[model samples]
Target: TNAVNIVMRQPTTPNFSSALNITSANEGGSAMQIRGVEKALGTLKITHENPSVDKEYDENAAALSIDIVKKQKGGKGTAAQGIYINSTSGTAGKMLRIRNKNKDKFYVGPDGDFWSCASSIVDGNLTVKDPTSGKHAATKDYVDEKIAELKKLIL
Candidate 1:
């Protein structure tokens, strides 16, 4: 017989939900995972991402406030983000609850500040470190504005 070849064409994008699942299950059970990682690596990567200048995404939003979450629920009654780490326990305006894997570690209040781990930033409490060196950065007017805003809440 002469040499023969066979080829299969898969859709560019397969059903992600199906792609990640138990392929074959025995009483023992099994699973698989992939990650681009190196010991003492340059950046901690958790999700598949493509950088675009026009539609650039923020890392703060992608990463959890604390321990990484596979997914969640039980904050204030919303559908738990699918276990693939797709949604949040809760979010700004969604409800008040945990955002990360660890129960109640890092979360947001109704204020919805992503820095909600809490910040000296909101009030006059923020004092510029090494003021003479000017290493840290922020606008005076902006800080002044929030100081006023924060004081309003304090009272």
Candidate 2:
């Protein structure tokens, strides 16, 4: 009896260097995400003025904006932030919340004050550093204690 020998080759995986589009399934279509990214960087140009002149993708919308987030709600881990800019070594690092009409809305600078348009309202108790220091807001408890002292002195 004679036995025949066969040679086999393993196929190479697909390489999509140019581009690859993954369409969602029809049933229960949801968003797709790429997790465990160490450093994924991209450039975004924000323009308040309308720039729909040249025909490329003629549209004037928000360059970068976070919306409708519900992933990390009521989770054990830290709640998800809309935008978290790491503290920079230099003094120029800050998150500027600009506006169209007001021109200056809010800012979160490294060594600067938080300048905003609307009135500052804290949901929880607003803690002050030192009441002796001027320009610091006194808490209701502090005011009450001061009033009690004044009443004792008067009596």
Each model's total of backbone clashes = 0, 0
* Lowest-sum lDDT 10-residue window in model 2: 37-46
lDDT of each: 0.47, 0.58
lDDT for model 2 comes to 0.58
Q: Candidate 2 — which residues are off by over 4 angstroms? A: 1-43, 48-62, 67-80, 133-135
> TM-scores of the models, in the given order?
0.20, 0.45
Tell me each candidate's RMSD, in Å, in order: 15.6, 15.6
- Candidate 1: list runs displaced more than 4 Å: 1-22, 33-47, 56-116, 119-155
Q: Report the lDDT tens digits of candidate 2 across residue range 111-146.
A: 655777788888988666547777767878778999
Q: Give the TM-score (vs. native) of candidate 1.
A: 0.20
